[PDB]
Amino acid sequence: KDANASHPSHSAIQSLSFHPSKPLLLTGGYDKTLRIYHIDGKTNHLVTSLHLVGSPIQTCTFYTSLSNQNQQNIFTAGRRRYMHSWDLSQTAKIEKFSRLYGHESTQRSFENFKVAHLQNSQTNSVHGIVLLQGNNGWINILHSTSGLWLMGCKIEGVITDFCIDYQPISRGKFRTILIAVNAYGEVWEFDLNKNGHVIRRWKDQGGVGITKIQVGGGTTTTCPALQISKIKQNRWLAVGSESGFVNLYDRNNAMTSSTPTPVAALDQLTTTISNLQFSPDGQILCMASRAVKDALRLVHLPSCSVFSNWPTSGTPLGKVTSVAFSPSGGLLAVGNEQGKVRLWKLNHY
Amino acid sequence: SPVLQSAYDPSGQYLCYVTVALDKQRVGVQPTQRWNENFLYLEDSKLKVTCLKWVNDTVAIILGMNNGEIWLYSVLANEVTYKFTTGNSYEIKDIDLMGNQLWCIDSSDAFYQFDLLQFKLLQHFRINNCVQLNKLTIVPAGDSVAQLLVASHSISLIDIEEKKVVMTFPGHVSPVSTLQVITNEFFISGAEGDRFLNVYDIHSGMTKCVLVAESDIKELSHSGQADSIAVTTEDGSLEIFVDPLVSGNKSKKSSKKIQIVSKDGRKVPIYNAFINKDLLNVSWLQNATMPYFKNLQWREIPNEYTVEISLNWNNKNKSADRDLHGKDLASATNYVEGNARVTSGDNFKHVTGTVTVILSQALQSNDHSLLETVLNNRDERVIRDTIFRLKPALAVILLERLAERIARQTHRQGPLNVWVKWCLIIHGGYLVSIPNLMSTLSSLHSTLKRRSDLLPRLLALDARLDCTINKFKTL
Amino acid sequence: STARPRIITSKAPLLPQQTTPEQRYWRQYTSAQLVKEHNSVTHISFNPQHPHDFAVTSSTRVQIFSSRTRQVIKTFSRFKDVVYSASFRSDGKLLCAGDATGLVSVYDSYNPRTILLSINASTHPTHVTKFHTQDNKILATASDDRVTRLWDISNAYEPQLELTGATDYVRTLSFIPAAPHLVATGSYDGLIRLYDTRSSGSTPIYSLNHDQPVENVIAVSPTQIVSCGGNNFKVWDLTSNKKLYERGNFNKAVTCLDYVENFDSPMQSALIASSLDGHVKVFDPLDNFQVKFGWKFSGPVLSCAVSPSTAQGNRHLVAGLSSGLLAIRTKKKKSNNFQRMMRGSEYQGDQEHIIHNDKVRSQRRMRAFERNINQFKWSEALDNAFVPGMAKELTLTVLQELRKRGKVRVALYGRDESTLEPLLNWCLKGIEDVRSASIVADWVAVVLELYGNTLESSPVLQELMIDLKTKVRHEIHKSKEAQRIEGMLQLLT
RNA sequence: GAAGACAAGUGCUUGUCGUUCGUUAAUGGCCU
């Protein structure tokens, strides 16, 4: 049963997220609502439905701290200058991140954010960070709870996407690498663990108009681990274009070759890529387009082959605007322009 | 309903309830009187909990379920202590534990008996003439275990010792859902989707009476002295029959009814009520999975009752930091003058060719468009002669109108100062006679006092002007 | 944190005769157009049901106007002698026309072509023909024959009740909204008759002893009527049979009078009256019928009328003068894929659980001086105040607030010889008022004590200080005269 | 009003205090 069938939305569902431990799907769209549903097998129900006033929601992801395991903040933003942070009776503690502590000239919109973690490396004090797109090349990194501007990296050209890769160096210590892309394909790899610098820059073979990068196969900003021990380096890197192609890169030779050859250039989607999401095991990559009905393609990994029997001509998709995986159950929640998040279950998991 | 199966402990202090969690079932225990975060997940996505029972030496619950084994799970430490293994691989439709002799039903009608102290299986044991069996209870005849009841779409009392069925009962057209013994001679029986409950005699075989509900029957609990039966219907409500065994005569309807309806007008479903000596514990789901409870004495409650609770249906989010509108409460509320009237301390309020007749006409009526035409003249002998032939009652009106024009027009203090001067001279004798002069000439006195206190400030500017004027006139 | 307070505009103690809220509503009746007429207009009556029309009478021609276009919609030119009155019915369909030839004609509104009815009254001219207010089928007319008649329009040949007992020249009558059996009748010698039509109807129940002739009677209330007669106008309580108020505030005799209740106004109801001096004065029964506002026209006014309570549009004041003039004063009043794109913009949270509004409410925009004071550019703030198009009230506000918060010396440290000239040009025009001269005194004395060295060489500021000297001679002497007339009030008290 | 302590003269003179007693002017401005 669809998760929106308990209580329907009114706008197009713009972003989804699953709780990293709890069964909880957070839905948000231009309805200015954060509808947290529960995910049963048969009877979904509303856990809560918070309606902000005047604040459209484009991206909304959960965040659980690595060390505390009890904060469970809910970060949402939109085409405004603020980001609403919801903590986890009757009321709701909602603070807004309407303060660029150094400079509001770069990011006049908060709508493109992704929440990752970071290690101090002076102390072993792990904490969340939020990363925001800016004016031209500026990716600005803020503190997740204190709100201070921590650091900020600028790429050349126009940002179109950014994703975050982890690297465990030693016992209980990991270095976070931010992977950001130009329109051209000049992919940069910043090292956020130390101060603002670059590890490597390279070129995606193709990708004249690039929409999304997702780094998956391990711990990612959408489906992370719950502790410093289970943080694992991602194994694959997907670079999505706007002409429908998606170029995959295995990290075992993309970190070495410095101008890496794509493993396979998938072509089965035509319109612009709206979502790239990897399964938490790393074996199913979900590419989704939003300019046409029935624009979902699952590809087997590492065979790089689209599944033939899924999806068919009788599946209900609509204009697919946001896809979500599940961290444990292997579920797949797919949004639409009709605001009906429809739920599927991969039965191997 | 999001909660699949929930079972109360004896004496009503906790319940263990199972629920779906990303297509992996989890079991949790909640106190019912007074949050919680401790659950047991099932590590496989296929195996599901079918039946549940408590044990009255830590408190442990019983999980006989789909995979074939029967789990023994201690509440205090989230850990299964032992798994009782059925020899075959079939789901367990029902469980019962009295003494140390656990009893369960295979899906293929095979009874089993398990010992708690030895952790052993006593006797895998099958019967005839019951092709499906899905519910069992045993009788509390003493310390013994004999003559367990087993039932599925018909009820049969079966003695263990002779391994035979003793007496059958005419069951129900649907499979039986609730089968509990109440007293030593009567046991309740209820089907699935049926609004009927029968107290069948364990010795006579004839039903004593039948209990009808208002809707279909899902969950049932009973008091130990057989004076109250608390049955939770499927649609979400609760009926309580008082004294079901008292002597329509054959069918007894709901004595009292308890519903739970939220404050906004929405209805709230009810699952798994509990009853005791004058104590009822209605349970429901506040959020999608979190269970909320309410103790309530059910004898003073009338025949129809609606418990009202507070769901945040359209609740405005008040904040501890925020005020009613944006600002903080440690933010000092700034002074705003706004639309405040500003007055003064002197403003009292209810404390030869003349133009006399055209001025008196312009003062008896409030024709200000003609008073100015009279007042354009500046020939001072005419001003003397007009006040001479002026009505003294109209002169007080003239002083009020002249005061309003000198207050509004500061440049008109030239010609109108001789008008007020000549009026107070001629009608001076009448003005002493009228006593409330502060009431009448309040506009005159306020304009004059305000134009007179300026003078030390204007003199201070003028001599300081004359210092710099005499500085440059000399050189 | 704390939100920054706005710079509050300064205010002196208020002068007497300030603008009342009731004056501020009534002075919106602007754009007074004037339409020439062939004779003295005597009656203006609006439409009760849909008040977008009002009928104006003239020499043999009642013409219907509009509330929207304020122009002539139709004309009625089927009259032998001059038409006197023209009153709409409460249904708004059928309008009377009392004619001086003797017989009255009533026909449908918005239709000159279909003369629906022509009742022959007595051979004397009929001055007023009014329809019933609560009832909608009975006409009441007067005449110079000193009798009023009540005609049911089903029988337009014989009067249903020949209401007699009048003394001389009944020229205005009115009904009473509570009782349908009670008809007020005003003669032309005083003696305001109150008649009963449920009775035999040939003698009044009582009379109101007005001395001078009455020209208009209007029911201001179910239990109060108001009498427009002679130099004043009086109100009467009907049940007590006693006068209550009397307002002698007119130069000549009041002629016409109209009343409106529960229209959108700062007061509950308003009573207007034409004064035959060009003055139409408004009164309110809650404030003991005192005068609140009075417009003045050129010639004397014979007919006054206001739009009724339920206009729902531009309201009108129609006043008709003796010289054939109708003065009208009027208070006036993408792609379908992109809607399926963003659908939740018009939702506002009608069914969600928790609503959290945290958008801070936008204020009035900040002015040029308030921005510079907040950014502490005090020297640039003082030059920002004296832009010549800006009001004199807020130039005093900048001078006060920069004196209070900062200093007047900090705003004058960086001044040049040319930069002082906008400052001294305003104190020339501001020294006269009492409202500013306490602040002008400090703001000029800082120039005299600091820039008294540059006056020695620059002749331009020398002319400014001389002209300030010649204006403070007038100001002190005016204040010296003000203390003399202050010395008057202690003599005569 | 006094004492305790440091600079400018080729060893003392030339001022002031995060010292006690007695006494009626670092280009540096206020969020979202």
mmCIF file of N, CA and C in Angstrom, chain C residues 112-168:
data_model
loop_
_atom_site.group_PDB
_atom_site.id
_atom_site.type_symbol
_atom_site.label_atom_id
_atom_site.label_comp_id
_atom_site.label_asym_id
_atom_site.label_seq_id
_atom_site.Cartn_x
_atom_site.Cartn_y
_atom_site.Cartn_z
ATOM 1 N N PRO C 112 -39.512 55.734 -19.280
ATOM 2 C CA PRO C 112 -40.386 56.884 -19.562
ATOM 3 C C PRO C 112 -41.565 56.554 -20.455
ATOM 4 N N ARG C 113 -41.510 55.452 -21.200
ATOM 5 C CA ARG C 113 -42.491 55.209 -22.250
ATOM 6 C C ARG C 113 -43.828 54.739 -21.689
ATOM 7 N N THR C 114 -43.805 53.921 -20.643
ATOM 8 C CA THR C 114 -45.015 53.286 -20.127
ATOM 9 C C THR C 114 -45.480 54.058 -18.900
ATOM 10 N N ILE C 115 -46.358 55.037 -19.119
ATOM 11 C CA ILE C 115 -47.013 55.713 -18.007
ATOM 12 C C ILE C 115 -48.020 54.729 -17.424
ATOM 13 N N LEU C 116 -47.680 54.174 -16.264
ATOM 14 C CA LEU C 116 -48.426 53.045 -15.726
ATOM 15 C C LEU C 116 -49.724 53.491 -15.075
ATOM 16 N N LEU C 117 -49.699 54.619 -14.374
ATOM 17 C CA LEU C 117 -50.860 55.058 -13.621
ATOM 18 C C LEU C 117 -50.883 56.574 -13.576
ATOM 19 N N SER C 118 -52.089 57.133 -13.619
ATOM 20 C CA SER C 118 -52.287 58.580 -13.525
ATOM 21 C C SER C 118 -53.512 58.813 -12.647
ATOM 22 N N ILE C 119 -53.284 58.957 -11.346
ATOM 23 C CA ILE C 119 -54.374 59.191 -10.405
ATOM 24 C C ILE C 119 -54.738 60.667 -10.446
ATOM 25 N N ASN C 120 -56.027 60.953 -10.587
ATOM 26 C CA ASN C 120 -56.507 62.328 -10.559
ATOM 27 C C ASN C 120 -56.817 62.711 -9.119
ATOM 28 N N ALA C 121 -55.969 63.555 -8.537
ATOM 29 C CA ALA C 121 -56.209 64.102 -7.208
ATOM 30 C C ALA C 121 -57.146 65.298 -7.299
ATOM 31 N N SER C 122 -57.230 66.086 -6.232
ATOM 32 C CA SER C 122 -57.990 67.324 -6.298
ATOM 33 C C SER C 122 -57.293 68.326 -7.216
ATOM 34 N N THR C 123 -58.055 69.336 -7.643
ATOM 35 C CA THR C 123 -57.592 70.284 -8.651
ATOM 36 C C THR C 123 -56.471 71.192 -8.161
ATOM 37 N N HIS C 124 -56.219 71.241 -6.856
ATOM 38 C CA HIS C 124 -55.064 71.947 -6.335
ATOM 39 C C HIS C 124 -53.781 71.196 -6.696
ATOM 40 N N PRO C 125 -52.652 71.901 -6.805
ATOM 41 C CA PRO C 125 -51.378 71.218 -7.055
ATOM 42 C C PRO C 125 -50.966 70.334 -5.890
ATOM 43 N N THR C 126 -50.294 69.235 -6.222
ATOM 44 C CA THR C 126 -49.824 68.266 -5.239
ATOM 45 C C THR C 126 -48.329 68.471 -5.040
ATOM 46 N N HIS C 127 -47.937 68.813 -3.814
ATOM 47 C CA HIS C 127 -46.546 69.161 -3.558
ATOM 48 C C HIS C 127 -45.686 67.931 -3.303
ATOM 49 N N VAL C 128 -46.175 66.974 -2.519
ATOM 50 C CA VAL C 128 -45.391 65.799 -2.161
ATOM 51 C C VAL C 128 -46.224 64.547 -2.409
ATOM 52 N N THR C 129 -45.631 63.574 -3.103
ATOM 53 C CA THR C 129 -46.231 62.260 -3.318
ATOM 54 C C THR C 129 -45.227 61.210 -2.869
ATOM 55 N N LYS C 130 -45.470 60.615 -1.707
ATOM 56 C CA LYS C 130 -44.575 59.630 -1.123
ATOM 57 C C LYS C 130 -45.248 58.267 -1.071
ATOM 58 N N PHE C 131 -44.452 57.235 -1.312
ATOM 59 C CA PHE C 131 -44.897 55.860 -1.160
ATOM 60 C C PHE C 131 -44.654 55.385 0.265
ATOM 61 N N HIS C 132 -45.408 54.362 0.656
ATOM 62 C CA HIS C 132 -45.272 53.782 1.984
ATOM 63 C C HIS C 132 -43.940 53.054 2.101
ATOM 64 N N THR C 133 -43.373 53.045 3.306
ATOM 65 C CA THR C 133 -42.071 52.416 3.491
ATOM 66 C C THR C 133 -42.214 50.927 3.789
ATOM 67 N N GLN C 134 -42.976 50.573 4.829
ATOM 68 C CA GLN C 134 -43.168 49.157 5.135
ATOM 69 C C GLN C 134 -44.138 48.514 4.149
ATOM 70 N N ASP C 135 -45.245 49.190 3.856
ATOM 71 C CA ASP C 135 -46.164 48.702 2.841
ATOM 72 C C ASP C 135 -45.661 49.091 1.456
ATOM 73 N N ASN C 136 -46.106 48.346 0.447
ATOM 74 C CA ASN C 136 -45.612 48.542 -0.908
ATOM 75 C C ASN C 136 -46.751 48.639 -1.913
ATOM 76 N N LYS C 137 -47.941 49.034 -1.464
ATOM 77 C CA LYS C 137 -49.062 49.139 -2.386
ATOM 78 C C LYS C 137 -49.945 50.355 -2.138
ATOM 79 N N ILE C 138 -49.569 51.270 -1.252
ATOM 80 C CA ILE C 138 -50.417 52.409 -0.928
ATOM 81 C C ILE C 138 -49.625 53.702 -1.084
ATOM 82 N N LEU C 139 -50.176 54.628 -1.863
ATOM 83 C CA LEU C 139 -49.581 55.930 -2.117
ATOM 84 C C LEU C 139 -50.204 56.951 -1.182
ATOM 85 N N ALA C 140 -49.379 57.854 -0.664
ATOM 86 C CA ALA C 140 -49.855 58.965 0.148
ATOM 87 C C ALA C 140 -49.417 60.262 -0.508
ATOM 88 N N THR C 141 -50.383 61.099 -0.861
ATOM 89 C CA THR C 141 -50.113 62.379 -1.491
ATOM 90 C C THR C 141 -50.720 63.498 -0.662
ATOM 91 N N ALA C 142 -50.128 64.675 -0.772
ATOM 92 C CA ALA C 142 -50.686 65.893 -0.213
ATOM 93 C C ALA C 142 -51.135 66.795 -1.352
ATOM 94 N N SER C 143 -51.608 67.982 -0.991
ATOM 95 C CA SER C 143 -52.025 68.960 -1.982
ATOM 96 C C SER C 143 -52.006 70.337 -1.343
ATOM 97 N N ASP C 144 -52.272 71.347 -2.170
ATOM 98 C CA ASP C 144 -52.588 72.671 -1.656
ATOM 99 C C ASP C 144 -54.031 72.770 -1.186
ATOM 100 N N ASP C 145 -54.831 71.722 -1.402
ATOM 101 C CA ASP C 145 -56.208 71.617 -0.937
ATOM 102 C C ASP C 145 -56.311 71.264 0.544
ATOM 103 N N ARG C 146 -55.183 71.255 1.269
ATOM 104 C CA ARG C 146 -55.116 71.097 2.726
ATOM 105 C C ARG C 146 -55.664 69.754 3.192
ATOM 106 N N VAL C 147 -55.595 68.745 2.329
ATOM 107 C CA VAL C 147 -55.954 67.381 2.682
ATOM 108 C C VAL C 147 -54.893 66.445 2.127
ATOM 109 N N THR C 148 -54.565 65.428 2.907
ATOM 110 C CA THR C 148 -53.762 64.322 2.421
ATOM 111 C C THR C 148 -54.676 63.162 2.059
ATOM 112 N N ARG C 149 -54.261 62.397 1.062
ATOM 113 C CA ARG C 149 -55.051 61.273 0.591
ATOM 114 C C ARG C 149 -54.177 60.035 0.542
ATOM 115 N N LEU C 150 -54.774 58.895 0.864
ATOM 116 C CA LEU C 150 -54.083 57.613 0.850
ATOM 117 C C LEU C 150 -54.756 56.742 -0.201
ATOM 118 N N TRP C 151 -54.086 56.551 -1.334
ATOM 119 C CA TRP C 151 -54.618 55.764 -2.434
ATOM 120 C C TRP C 151 -53.959 54.394 -2.461
ATOM 121 N N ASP C 152 -54.776 53.349 -2.435
ATOM 122 C CA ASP C 152 -54.325 52.033 -2.858
ATOM 123 C C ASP C 152 -54.286 52.018 -4.378
ATOM 124 N N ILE C 153 -53.170 51.558 -4.949
ATOM 125 C CA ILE C 153 -52.993 51.642 -6.397
ATOM 126 C C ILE C 153 -53.848 50.649 -7.165
ATOM 127 N N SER C 154 -54.478 49.691 -6.479
ATOM 128 C CA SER C 154 -55.496 48.865 -7.120
ATOM 129 C C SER C 154 -56.702 49.702 -7.526
ATOM 130 N N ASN C 155 -57.115 50.630 -6.667
ATOM 131 C CA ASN C 155 -58.233 51.535 -6.930
ATOM 132 C C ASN C 155 -57.671 52.949 -7.058
ATOM 133 N N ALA C 156 -57.281 53.318 -8.278
ATOM 134 C CA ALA C 156 -56.666 54.612 -8.546
ATOM 135 C C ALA C 156 -57.679 55.672 -8.956
ATOM 136 N N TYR C 157 -58.920 55.560 -8.490
ATOM 137 C CA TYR C 157 -59.961 56.531 -8.800
ATOM 138 C C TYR C 157 -60.644 57.117 -7.575
ATOM 139 N N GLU C 158 -60.687 56.402 -6.453
ATOM 140 C CA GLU C 158 -61.338 56.872 -5.243
ATOM 141 C C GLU C 158 -60.356 56.734 -4.085
ATOM 142 N N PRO C 159 -60.194 57.766 -3.252
ATOM 143 C CA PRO C 159 -59.223 57.680 -2.151
ATOM 144 C C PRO C 159 -59.703 56.724 -1.073
ATOM 145 N N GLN C 160 -58.786 55.878 -0.604
ATOM 146 C CA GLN C 160 -59.130 54.891 0.412
ATOM 147 C C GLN C 160 -59.363 55.545 1.769
ATOM 148 N N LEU C 161 -58.650 56.628 2.063
ATOM 149 C CA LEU C 161 -58.832 57.344 3.322
ATOM 150 C C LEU C 161 -58.478 58.806 3.110
ATOM 151 N N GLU C 162 -59.492 59.670 3.058
ATOM 152 C CA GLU C 162 -59.278 61.103 2.859
ATOM 153 C C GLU C 162 -58.859 61.700 4.192
ATOM 154 N N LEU C 163 -57.552 61.810 4.381
ATOM 155 C CA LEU C 163 -56.971 62.237 5.647
ATOM 156 C C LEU C 163 -57.044 63.755 5.743
ATOM 157 N N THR C 164 -57.954 64.261 6.565
ATOM 158 C CA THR C 164 -58.218 65.691 6.644
ATOM 159 C C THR C 164 -57.872 66.211 8.037
ATOM 160 N N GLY C 165 -58.213 67.474 8.278
ATOM 161 C CA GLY C 165 -57.910 68.136 9.527
ATOM 162 C C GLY C 165 -56.701 69.040 9.489
ATOM 163 N N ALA C 166 -56.066 69.195 8.333
ATOM 164 C CA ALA C 166 -54.891 70.040 8.216
ATOM 165 C C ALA C 166 -55.276 71.511 8.238
ATOM 166 N N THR C 167 -54.307 72.355 8.592
ATOM 167 C CA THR C 167 -54.586 73.780 8.710
ATOM 168 C C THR C 167 -54.311 74.515 7.404
ATOM 169 N N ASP C 168 -53.075 74.438 6.905
ATOM 170 C CA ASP C 168 -52.689 75.165 5.695
ATOM 171 C C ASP C 168 -51.458 74.526 5.074
#
